Amino acid sequence: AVVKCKPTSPGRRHVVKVVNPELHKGKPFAPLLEKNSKSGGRNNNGRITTRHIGGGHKQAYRIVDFKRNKDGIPAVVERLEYDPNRSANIALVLYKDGERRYILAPKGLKAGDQIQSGVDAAIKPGNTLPMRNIPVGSTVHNVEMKPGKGGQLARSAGTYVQIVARDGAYVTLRLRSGEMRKVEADCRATLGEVGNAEHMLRVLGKAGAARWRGVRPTVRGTAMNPVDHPHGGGEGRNFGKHPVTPWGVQTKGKKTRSNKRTDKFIVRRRS
RNA sequence: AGGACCGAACCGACUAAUGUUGAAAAAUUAGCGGAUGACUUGUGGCUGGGGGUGAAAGGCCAAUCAAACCGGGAGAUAGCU
RNA sequence: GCUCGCCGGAAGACCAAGGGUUCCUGUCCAACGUUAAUCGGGGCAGGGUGAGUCGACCCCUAAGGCGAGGCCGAAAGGCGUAGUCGAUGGGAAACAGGUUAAUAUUCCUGUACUUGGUGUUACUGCGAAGGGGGGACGGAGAAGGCUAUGUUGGCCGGGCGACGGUUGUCCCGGUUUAAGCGUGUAGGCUGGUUUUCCAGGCAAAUCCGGAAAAUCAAGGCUGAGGCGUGAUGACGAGGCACUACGGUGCUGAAGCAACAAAUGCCCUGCUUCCAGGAAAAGCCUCUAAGCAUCAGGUAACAUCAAAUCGUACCCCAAACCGACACAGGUGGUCAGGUAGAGAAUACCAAGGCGCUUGAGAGAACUCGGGUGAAGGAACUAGGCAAAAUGGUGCCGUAACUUCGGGAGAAGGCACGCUGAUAUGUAGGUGAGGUCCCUCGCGGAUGGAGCUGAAAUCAGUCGAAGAUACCAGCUGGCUGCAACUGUUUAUUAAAAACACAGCACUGUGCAAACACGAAAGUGGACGUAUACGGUGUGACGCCUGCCCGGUGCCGGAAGGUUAAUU
RNA sequence: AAUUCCUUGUCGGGUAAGUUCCGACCUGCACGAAUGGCGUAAUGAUGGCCAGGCUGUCUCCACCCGAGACUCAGUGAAAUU
RNA sequence: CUUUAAUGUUUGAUGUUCUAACGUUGACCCGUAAUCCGGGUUGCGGACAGUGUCUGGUGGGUAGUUUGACUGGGGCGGUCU
């Protein structure tokens, strides 16, 4: 649930929280956890590859099951759980065989609901089947791009795709980006939308709330000296040139997609 | 509950005086600011010079930075002293 | 040696880091010490550092490093797997007292414990580079139960006061005692037990997990402290004998209780919030291959072993880092008394110092301070500096406002001491006894004793009762930025930089982008409610006109146009 | 106006007297709407201005307490030339 | 030898299809108690992609350099035979 806190102090007027009581107020299933040390935006060479990364709260990685290869074995939901490594919530399930696993939380799932994977599974949210058997015009999430590796699309808080057509060994999809992409007609996909849509309405309210996420301040460039950035400086606010990243790239329309390898599944890229 | 209030430790360094071959190659005295947090700190580790890092001042990188230090090319060149 | 004065949340005590004999004794005074020097962190000689339990080594691992093969690269060499290293983390065990000129939980006395080895006996399914559990973990907050510790009383010993009084409600001192073993409480978590089945735990599995039944609810785990033992001992104020007044033997009384009470323990708990909170081994289990009249394993007793290195001394400093015996900087532990909200502050205890030139004089001027006639910012670039305000409780408190604030607004009154209310109250604590009882560290009752506010009434002293130290100046108009913050170490802390928020834009995952001749890595073990970049900069009302120029995004008939032929 | 050269613009407020401050007028030398415009409570060691109280800031300094200065003894520099 | 159609064959262009090169930061198995790597099986792509040589354009992202003299100081202007 979304709630607007009161302005009892500068730093809480425009803050907004997303409170969900369905989440388990305790410790998670340890057997599915592992170490995850932050990187600060650096690489094996110790150099900063991506800026604005550093600090924040500690984190543990919940091993999620994105493949869903446990076919023909139903499972019930034990409880929901908060996952920091991602924007979406997850679900702790229980298979009849005694095994437990993690998955992404669909829109309206709860505890006690039964789910099943495979080709003969039921057409209901949570269940997983290959798109070869999914009806056209439906909504799914956690889509696979190559059979067997695991889902890669529609993994975020409130993201969902829509199957629009299936001709042959391939299926076409309109992604949440408006792009019209096609994939092999054997990839698995989970019905329903990922349920945390109240996440976008969240608000940090103050800078410190960003530093908890591991985000660092972003220096513009205009106020940064000529040696540092193309925008450089000048007495006052001049910026009398074209917008450009460091290293000399426009950043205001210049398409940098230079794949040219697949370039077949793209139909209606966007806009 | 709080990047909340007063205020010691602690971290800072706004004003003034002193000192300026100083007690000190940036400190002291009397006050001041923050003081559960983007806080602070000990240990260890990574990032190496046209590069690093930088809540960005051309700032910091061993009292040295508009391109560190050491050695080498090197007895650079100097129509200038 | 007698006085004085300073610190006393340190200028005291114990360590790490670091230094590396500066420690102790004797001796020397040329040099070193900012003076002298019989002294010294100085010179010379000698002596001194004793560990199964502290620490390191060792076992395990994080960040991260090296990196067999291997991938990559003109060479050098780079990244990295298996693995191996790497604490600032995890992992077995000792306390008290006494003692040396100098060491000690290391020596001695006394009392204990831990891990292994071997052997005897008895009972026995043992076995892993594997599986599972466990180890294993955040912030804030809230109390409650305890202790360290302290105060008072009582007891014991001693004392009767240089000057009035002091045999009493008088004065001083002491009233200490551990780990360990046993009890297993306050209180906290958990429902157990037996049988049966199974697509799982890379194979197995009595274990874990899951499912279905029956049967019982009391079962277990954790757990400060207290109590008892440890302890007929040790210590102990003080005496008796030696006593070179340098010390040694022996003796050695009381050694209880109440109250207060921690930031420390129960607490790695409980409640709660979002930013969602290390790993591995030891340890407890599981079984596989394998070994079974063996071997191994469990318990008891015996006996052996527990090596090696460090241990002195300083450690907020004269010994470390600062060229110096330098107003500097330096992490952790202990945390007394009165007042006090308080680790502030003031005066003190234990303890440790009086900061390595002194004497004298008492001009100008300088520094650091105190007071001030009348006036009260007229000074001055500027109320810079200084002065002043300063605490608690009650009343009371505007504009404006995002309805939280503004606000401690402003402003006003009372504060001491003694006595009574009440021979010390409300409250808190809680003895003895009585009653019960699963008869225990119990429960109910019980209210002695101890402690102890606050307020009221009257009275009283003083110029002044928040008397000292400590301890907000307030108010009004306005520009900038929203705010908390960050910044030019060493002349600039701001209207700059960040910021949440908004928008445009790119990016469909072997993502864009970046570091990299490359491999590969980060981005991200993320997936368009995500990520990167750019600009703007809370919030509120709004963000208008122009695409000729530059650039970007598309489009296509024609024209021009490279290599090549 | 953090933007205004002419300029101490003009009027008025406040002052005995105000090149600054505040509020209006517009002839905007040379504001202008995300290199954002206009307002904005709160906040600020922020800039500017006016009052209350306060005072040695000053009129105009005076006296005193301490460390140096000065004299004696001991040790014993420096820039400069 | 002037001529033009169905052929044989030639090479070029376009499209569709295929797999055997190549790729596979897809799955499974082995080396192997190893998310590297290699090999194998299979699938998806597929002669595209991507790399090398040559080449056009773009290219302050990064370097190397230039940016005159006289002058009643220099610059501006002016001048230079």
Curated annotation (Swiss-Prot):
Residues 38-47 have a biased composition (Low complexity). Disulfide bonds: none annotated. InterPro entries: NA-bd_OB-fold, Rib_uL2_dom2, Ribosomal_uL2, Ribosomal_uL2_bac/org-type, Ribosomal_uL2_C, Ribosomal_uL2_CS, Ribosomal_uL2_dom3, Ribosomal_uL2_RNA-bd_dom. Coiled coil: none annotated. Gene3D superfamilies: 2.30.30.30, Nucleic acid-binding proteins, Ribosomal protein L2, domain 3. Residues 27-52, 220-271 are annotated as: Disordered. PROSITE patterns: RIBOSOMAL_L2 (PS00467). Keywords: Acetylation, Ribonucleoprotein, Ribosomal protein, RNA-binding, rRNA-binding. GO terms for molecular function: RNA binding; rRNA binding; structural constituent of ribosome; transferase activity; zinc ion binding. One of its GO terms (biological process) is cytoplasmic translation. Pfam families: Ribosomal_L2 (PF00181), Ribosomal_L2_C (PF03947). One of its GO terms (cellular component) is DnaA-L2 complex. The modification N6-acetyllysine is found at residue 241. One of the primary rRNA binding proteins. Located near the base of the L1 stalk, it is probably also mobile. Required for association of the 30S and 50S subunits to form the 70S ribosome, for tRNA binding and peptide bond formation. It has been suggested to have peptidyltransferase activity; this is highly controversial. In the E.coli 70S ribosome in the initiation state it has been modeled to make several contacts with the 16S rRNA (forming bridge B7b, PubMed:12809609); these contacts are broken in the model with bound EF-G. Part of the 50S ribosomal subunit. Forms a bridge to the 30S subunit in the 70S ribosome, contacting the 16S rRNA. Interacts weakly with S6 in one of the 3.5 A resolved structures. In pull-down experiments interacts with CedA. This protein can be partially replaced in vivo by its H.marismortui (HmaL2) or human (L8, from the 60S cytoplasmic ribosome) homolog. Belongs to the universal ribosomal protein uL2 family. PANTHER family: LARGE RIBOSOMAL SUBUNIT PROTEIN UL2M (PTHR13691:SF5), RIBOSOMAL PROTEIN L2 (PTHR13691). This is Large ribosomal subunit protein uL2. It comes from Escherichia coli (strain K12). The lineage of its organism: Bacteria, Pseudomonadati, Pseudomonadota, Gammaproteobacteria, Enterobacterales.
